[model samples]
Target: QIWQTNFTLEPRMAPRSWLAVTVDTASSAIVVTQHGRVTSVAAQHHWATAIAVLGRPKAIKTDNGSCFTSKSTREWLARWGIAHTTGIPGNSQGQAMVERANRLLKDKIRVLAEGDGFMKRIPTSKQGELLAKAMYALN
Candidate 1:
């Protein structure tokens, strides 16, 4: 039921993977967020997956990246009747909140990365599970 909504990306495994995040602006809480592989289709697939769990936001605010603006992605959002709001190319202020979520998520992963002394990064297989742990603390 929120009117203001948002998303951001955090690259993981640099060359081919990243996290797609969606947030509820009203409470500054994440609705659907995850680390996964990427591409144009990956972007749409990722958004659809999150929408399924978050129950379809009234709208989604994203950057003007091809991931959100491409015909495929836009058409998908149109199919769901979710308005797509895109920010200017250099909307630093407009993106601060979403960036904050990324930073906080990073810190949470940092704390979780501990307890094994040597495993400074979260195990690839455990990323999904540990992200759940982080979201629990935030949400």
Candidate 2:
């Protein structure tokens, strides 16, 4: 395992939605967040940022999310000379590292919200910071 990307939601955000997350499977570290969306463009942006920080990976493991499997995304990865592959449709075991990071992120957000009223109503702008903190704590 080297690098993988996925989307997760911050339930406490006012208008809850997906946040693109990229993880370095080898180190179990969160590389970056696209901050929001499940669109192909969004996915591309996230991966671009991740590559800038960690350099391109030989291959990237992902789930079958539309954003990840779209022609645009596939072309983008191909242009970067990075191979893109997916796990079984319903099997999370194939990408356990990133999946586990998603679970821990949600759990950490829930705990933070419960621990302080201030965290219960997160602004869209602040959700990124909150998520970054959670990732930092988890790692």
Candidate 3:
């Protein structure tokens, strides 16, 4: 009956965006590259895959992002018997665990890209691979 939180990255310049789902109480997370915008369909697909791998969670918590709050996404969660909750408006602390996880991952990516001049010229195509490696190291 654990609660989970989801987040996505929108870097100014990168190969592609990324998605992360953090299990709030468990302190575990999954990071994946997103090929498109964060829409309900994309979110649902990520949730479905996450649930399949991690087993179903009791509930999910997220910010007021349309992808998380949309009727379609809500209905999908409801159909799975998973409760959905949104964080307090304008309060990052409301979903601190996911926020922290995002921050850590972002830092990892930055360091991986800029740690040494050898890795400084990381190409866009390799960003997702770097992210996956960073996530693996973190986990």
Candidate 4:
């Protein structure tokens, strides 16, 4: 089993509107991306490709955000035969793993963003490439 998570980027760093993060609990291996906006279709696409990028887990865990909780996402996961484990809002403990990873990634990301003088957004797609490598390198 594995747990997946996500959070929005504030506009100051508006390279991408959202990010998707997933972790393998047993291995502590992770995948992350500056994928797309806060829409169901984008969220679905991230996970579908995640299935290929990281082998499909029998179950997934995520916060109860609109994108994850909506029927479209629900149906999409069901189609993939993944069971959803929901996290309640205000309980930061439920998302501890991803949150710490997210913080680590964010620090590195801030370095990247600053390298460009923080003038224009760094090319968004590059984030996925960098993050995927960084995660496995650390683990």
Candidate 5:
């Protein structure tokens, strides 16, 4: 079975922001989105809660980022009896699913916010909200 999850981090600036993580269960055809920066324990719990509510998995994998390696996240998975794994360092191909989603996010956000009228409708400060809403709407 092929399962995938997609998440978007909404930084206040191009440099840093919050993340909206969405888990896509291919077999069940369900998607759940959560708010906050990806590194925060809140975001991890939110993501895991969505997954747990849906169902547990055989294996879980993510990039070798700090949030993915957080103590809380590790504990959560351990408590849930979910096997966890991390992608290889500097190995982009191994993380294709999530990386592809990242690219799609960039393209989608850029395309959605690229006009005067759209810009007027979505304030620069609220771009993240608009982007998240647009993603949920279109997806």
Candidate 6:
């Protein structure tokens, strides 16, 4: 099993968002995106794709976001026969794996954006792309 979630950074104007997932096996890896304010749909798709690429876990878990609970996601999971579960409401720690990854991703984005003017440098339309690149290349 694996857990997935999204997180956003503050300051409102040019917030950074992340899509992160943590898998159960030792070989299973947590995938994270460094994008700016990703939509719930986008995060869900990203996590679904990552899980598929990892050879399909028996089940996948996430928070009860609109995307995760959407008809499309449910249908897709059903097609693959993978159980899709959501955590309890208002309790982030209930989804500890992905929540922890989200926190770490946000901290990194905050440090980089503040010190390097990463968000300020990018045009509004390109912010998400820039953030995704940063996350992809992050160590």
Q: Per-residue error at 127 for model 3, in Å? A: 3.0
Q: Which tens-of-lDDT digit does each residue in 1-139 have in candidate 3?
A: 5554665564622434656556545756654445456688887887777776567888877778888889999899999999888876435555776667767777777777675333444566666677667778777
Candidate 5 Cα lDDT to native? 0.53
TM-score of 6: 0.62
Per-model TM-score on C-alpha atoms: 0.78, 0.82, 0.77, 0.77, 0.61, 0.62
- Give every collision pair in model 1: none
How would you encode candidate 5's per-residue C-alpha lDDT over 71-98 as one tens digit per residue? 8778876887766677654345434555
lDDT of 1 by residue, 70-135 (tens): 898888878889887788653664456666776787666667657434255455666666767777
Measured on C-alpha atoms, candidate 6 has an lDDT of 0.56
lDDT of 1 at 120: 50
The local distance difference test score of each candidate is: 0.62, 0.74, 0.67, 0.68, 0.53, 0.56
Q: State residue 11's C-alpha deviation in candidate 4, in Å.
A: 5.5
By how many angstroms RMSD does model 6 differ from the true structure?
A: 4.2
Separately for all candidates shown, the number of backbone clashes (residues 3 or more apart, or on different chains) is: 0, 0, 0, 0, 6, 1
Q: Model 1 reaches what TM-score against the true structure?
A: 0.78
Best by TM-score: 2
**What are the per-model C-alpha RMSD values against the true structure?**
3.1, 2.4, 2.9, 3.0, 4.5, 4.2
Candidate 4: give the clashing pairs: none
- lDDT of candidate 6 over 40-132, digit per residue (tens): 556556666666656566777766877678887787778878787787643654466556555555665556566656544334565565455
User: What does candidate 2's lDDT look like per residue over 38-132, in tens digits?
Assistant: 69998888888888777888888888888888999999988988988887643565477777777787788777756655646676676667766
lDDT, candidate 1, equals 0.62
Index of the highest-lDDT prediction: 2
